[PDB]
Amino acid sequence: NMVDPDFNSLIELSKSAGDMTKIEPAMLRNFLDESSLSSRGAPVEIKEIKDYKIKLDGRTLNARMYDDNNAKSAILYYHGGGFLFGNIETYDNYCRFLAKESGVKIISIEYRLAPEHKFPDAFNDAYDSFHYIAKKKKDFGIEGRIGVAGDSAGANLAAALCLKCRDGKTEMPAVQVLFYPSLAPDNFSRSFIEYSDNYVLTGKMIRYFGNMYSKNINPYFSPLVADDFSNLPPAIMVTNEYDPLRDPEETYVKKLREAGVRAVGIRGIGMIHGSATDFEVSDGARNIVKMVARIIPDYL
Amino acid sequence: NMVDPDFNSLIELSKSAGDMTKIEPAMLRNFLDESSLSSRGAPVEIKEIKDYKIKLDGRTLNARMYDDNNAKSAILYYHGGGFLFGNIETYDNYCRFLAKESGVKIISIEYRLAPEHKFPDAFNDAYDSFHYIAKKKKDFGIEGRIGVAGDSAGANLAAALCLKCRDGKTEMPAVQVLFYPSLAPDNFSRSFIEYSDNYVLTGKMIRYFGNMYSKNINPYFSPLVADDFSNLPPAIMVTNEYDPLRDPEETYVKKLREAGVRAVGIRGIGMIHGSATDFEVSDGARNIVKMVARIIPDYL
Amino acid sequence: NMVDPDFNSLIELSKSAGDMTKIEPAMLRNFLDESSLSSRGAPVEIKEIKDYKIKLDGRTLNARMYDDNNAKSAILYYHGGGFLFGNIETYDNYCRFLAKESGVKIISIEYRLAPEHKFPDAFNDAYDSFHYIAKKKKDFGIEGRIGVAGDSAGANLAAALCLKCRDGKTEMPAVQVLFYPSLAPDNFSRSFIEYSDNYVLTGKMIRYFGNMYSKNINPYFSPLVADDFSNLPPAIMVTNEYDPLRDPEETYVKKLREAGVRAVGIRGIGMIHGSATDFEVSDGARNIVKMVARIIPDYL
Amino acid sequence: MVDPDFNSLIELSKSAGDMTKIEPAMLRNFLDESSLSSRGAPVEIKEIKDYKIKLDGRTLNARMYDDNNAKSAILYYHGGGFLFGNIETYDNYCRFLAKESGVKIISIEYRLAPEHKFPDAFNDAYDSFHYIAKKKKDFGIEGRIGVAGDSAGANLAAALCLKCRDGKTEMPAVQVLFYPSLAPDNFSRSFIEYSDNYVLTGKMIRYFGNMYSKNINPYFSPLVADDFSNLPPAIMVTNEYDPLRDPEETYVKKLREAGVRAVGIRGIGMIHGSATDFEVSDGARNIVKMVARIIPDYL
């Protein structure tokens, strides 16, 4: 079709890697994280960076805080990587870029990964970490509001934790910033089948990541299963034109607005899955990320 | 929105009937059946009509056979109605039209209806009746081949029974003719969100029908949950442009072809859910039904 | 995307020929017509085939009449080829198949080709040949009705000649059977941009053909520029899912139904431009052509 | 699934019915007064200055907004179908663009149809860009100049860039295109699917097209252009439920095929006019803020 030519390389890198559903998952995570750290740019400079230990019930997560503006308010960032890879180090240039462009604190959280830890572990990490930080604000130097954000699998966690906050009548995030979340048990929508091969994220990789994270349709795994979208936090949704996960995301925006939740959704023309973390590689993608980061503070 | 103007009365009738999820199951069935009985045109004349009792393990189904052409072969037809409504009487004019246009025997089978009978009752009715007639083909005067067909819920039964025949390595139908089946657990595709209000079948009614059929994602309820599409019978798939159920159906026919199963799919431009049984009100619809019925005999 | 895998060979062969837009038209015509004759399959047997000279004012056209059924009625068929190529011989296997499946006379007419003969020559050939045969019907053994049909550029001629019959209040054809016509001045619709390079009918070639046919708003060149679709003949419209020409065609069907003209439109799922004349290599395409051909006699 | 914020505007537009028989000066009057009547509170801006741009054979009004003592500028061509709109009815919106972008916004009043048919507005846009590019110091401009517009004004912005490139003249720094009309379209899928019920109708499109044309030229319709290379970096914003959407998404794909820097976003649930509806739709407001906040990076 008309995918942005900036992606030509990645769409090659993808094809010539061949099939990977057959190599050990721990082996696979390692390779992918190493790739991501490779041809990367100068990290934008951030005034203060601080490392944290989020001591939860029965597990401790690493969190890195990025702050360029002695910011009052924060976003908790949950990285993508299909619930299998990504970590603070591979997301470091991107979270820096987010912090610089938003001028708010960005707290990048390492939830537990599949297949060692299956659902609901990473979900419970996101929900518990939000509430940990929401109670321990001062430790993180947060004087204002806290929202949540993520990309891909991490944006699934961000959306899901907000549903749980709403369901339990708990403290709510101020905003949910969702860069192309997985949301639904989808092997059949039109975006899924049309873009199910060759656009970096494949139909086969979706099923494989799905098999690794799940044991054996709950709303905290798949938010589009929820019965009610009212009283969720204001949302920013970013979708990609050529991405199997596109259609369910655009439905989610529409459901939020129907429920009277404040929500802006934009589809990036010519973009693919992973666009946001491709900000150093695609100027269109970089401008989409800059657009979102620059309005984030208005919600905090 | 460019829906065929022949549907305008039906769409209005449907909006002015109010919120149907509101009314109790058996009451709604009766009202929907009586609504279709009124819309009825003059029945097409058929040379031989015969009534049968299909005597299955623990229940007996009515079946009616229409034969305008002393035909060697037959199609078993499972009526639509969301698993809640429809019967031989409401389908009689349409089944006569199919028999006249195809020149083959059409056997319309009354399966058991939800909510009184939930999954897998209708499903087992479809699969058992296929095998009953296949085993007893001389009782129906069938000397050639037997295929299966349906519309909406009935085409779900047709596609699902073919999956079970394949899985069990049993006798297979010769062809599966699917008019707009339900196939997937879908509350999120683009067709579902875009067309879930003003097009006769609503998103709300889809959810009501689904909760009535189900107990409590397995392939005989939702064929799109299947692992494997190889070795299924040749298929004819008809979708409608303005129908929330459309995108999964188009995916289904692409997954059949991907597996090497012979399949032809057509989307009816400007058509809505129910178009085939609306053959007396829309000439567009009538010609789509005629197109399909006239190629059936080539598979038999 | 999910193009039916039956077309993978044609897509590859189209890629292998490279960019033919700097080829001189007469050389390209030779290449494409001779390529087609060299690689075609076994022809279907037809009871009677007869060649005619259509003696119009100022020029004589070749016509071949195919009749498997001593039929009373006829379709005048105008072949495709971008206005530049194709002829009776390259269409002969396909015209035979239409005759066998429809049971009516098919008269394949050789209109004048561009750039040697620019618009309005082919159009005048199409309109004048319809009126010539309609006046002289008894000479061709036609006792019943006459419709018109074509594919691609030939379906443009069929749709355009109907518009001029309507405008002039002359005898109108009984039906217009349009397989994926060119209809509009389009280098910008979504089907055009999404599907215009995957090799078979490209954007660059669509331009090359239009520039060869135009001398430099005329509804008889582009029917979508007509301001009125009333009182046109009943239409059958076939479009292909993965074809740059698709979206204007699907708009044309809708415009016809908005003006109250009988029309049925079907989009072939997984099909590409040229699908009908590909009937020997794709069973899905073959079944779409059979569907259409078998309802043609109802209009005559 | 149109954003519920537009429910009212869609209803009001349905109510009005087909206004083809209203004299074009009266339709202009009514639509302009309707815009003024529904203004919210204006955003305060540090400096606003009025100018006359004396061109060959006509003078244009222009209004400069500057909230940030800025060095660079965007020339803004309002929308209105080539028939209506003016500096006053665009004043709340150009104030918001100037507040959110922190660069100078200079809103230019080009000549309107049908009194002034193509190529008058087009010449006004191209000539006023070159006038101010040649005379930058007279406007307090020390840096760069880009061009922008919505709907018909975004057509003028796109078309003037094509002429700059064709004449190898000075080029704007960036072209910021809010849902321009670009092509002779009465047949795309967005055109036919969103031709009624979405405020801008297929009948209005033909009507404005007929008022502008003296009755396939690329400075009328940029999608007719031969070649898209060497055009200014672009930001393209389209609306999901708008008959003009598909050609616009084609244009962004063509710019990128030509190696022009471009970023294109489709606003989910949005309709034609979404940017100038920033006072009534928060999603629309957030789209305009997204775009305005990136503008300074090109200047």
Side-chain angles (χ1 to χ4, degrees), chain D residues 28-73:
Chain D
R28 176 181 298 124
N29 190 259
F30 173 64
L31 294 169
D32 287 348
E33 291 288 331
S34 182
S35 305
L36 291 179
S37 81
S38 74
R39 286 179 290 185
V43 174
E44 297 173 350
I45 292 302
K46 284 186 192 181
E47 296 179 85
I48 299 172
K49 293 181 150 109
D50 283 333
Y51 298 92
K52 306 294 189 153
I53 297 185
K54 287 181 80 168
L55 305 177
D56 182 12
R58 72 290 193 199
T59 295
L60 315 174
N61 290 329
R63 177 171 293 164
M64 177 163 77
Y65 311 78
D66 184 2
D67 204 40
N68 189 41
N69 191 30
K71 57 185 273 217
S72 285

Side-chain angles (χ1 to χ4, degrees), chain D residues 232-252:
Chain D
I235 301 176
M236 171 77 76
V237 179
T238 71
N239 304 296
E240 181 173 21
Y241 292 113
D242 174 349
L244 292 185
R245 183 193 71 185
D246 281 355
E248 292 167 358
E249 289 190 355
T250 296
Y251 197 80
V252 305

Side-chain angles (χ1 to χ4, degrees), chain B residues 1-2 190 193-197 241-242 246 267, chain D residues 1 189 192-195 197-198 240-241 245 266:
Chain B
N1 167 351
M2 300 296 275
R190 189 171 178 87
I193 203 68
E194 301 301 292
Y195 307 133
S196 57
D197 290 322
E241 179 170 13
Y242 293 114
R246 174 195 80 186
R267 176 202 284 203
Chain D
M1 289 307 263
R189 189 169 182 90
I192 202 70
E193 296 301 290
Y194 307 130
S195 244
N197 310 341
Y198 297 93
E240 181 173 21
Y241 292 113
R245 183 193 71 185
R266 177 196 289 202

Side-chain angles (χ1 to χ4, degrees), chain A residues 140-189:
Chain A
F140 286 92
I142 292 153
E143 306 297 85
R145 321 266 238 112
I146 308 156
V148 296
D151 65 289
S152 195
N156 168 267
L157 297 166
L161 84 84
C162 286
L163 280 175
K164 191 186 174 153
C165 287
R166 190 277 322 270
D167 285 345
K169 298 175 210 301
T170 79
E171 177 179 349
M172 300 299 284
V175 62
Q176 48 185 319
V177 178
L178 310 175
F179 281 99
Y180 42 88
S182 53
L183 294 164
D186 179 28
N187 66 338
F188 52 75
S189 69

Side-chain angles (χ1 to χ4, degrees), chain C residues 28 93 95 155 235 282:
Chain C
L28 177 69
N93 278 16
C95 285
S282 162

Side-chain angles (χ1 to χ4, degrees), chain D residues 94-201:
Chain D
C94 286
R95 289 167 177 264
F96 182 75
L97 290 184
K99 169 66 92 209
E100 291 300 333
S101 62
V103 308
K104 282 174 178 334
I105 304 298
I106 300 170
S107 171
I108 296 164
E109 261 185 8
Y110 57 84
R111 309 100 102 192
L112 306 168
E115 299 86 351
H116 303 276
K117 287 168 176 282
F118 178 83
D120 294 347
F122 167 74
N123 281 338
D124 295 343
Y126 175 92
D127 302 344
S128 63
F129 166 66
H130 285 292
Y131 179 102
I132 300 176
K134 274 176 337 236
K135 302 179 171 307
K136 306 191 303 183
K137 50 166 202 203
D138 304 1
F139 295 86
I141 307 167
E142 318 177 10
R144 293 181 175 95
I145 297 170
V147 297
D150 56 295
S151 193
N155 168 281
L156 298 174
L160 81 85
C161 289
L162 283 172
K163 182 167 179 175
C164 293
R165 174 263 256 145
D166 291 347
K168 311 196 171 90
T169 78
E170 193 181 337
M171 306 288 301
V174 57
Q175 51 181 316
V176 179
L177 302 177
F178 285 99
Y179 42 84
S181 47
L182 289 167
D185 185 20
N186 68 336
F187 59 71
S188 68
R189 189 169 182 90
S190 62
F191 174 91
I192 202 70
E193 296 301 290
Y194 307 130
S195 244
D196 275 287
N197 310 341
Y198 297 93
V199 183
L200 172 69
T201 70

Side-chain angles (χ1 to χ4, degrees), chain A residues 6 23 83 165 173 227 242:
Chain A
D6 288 343
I23 272 309
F83 292 107
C165 287
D227 209 344
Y242 297 111

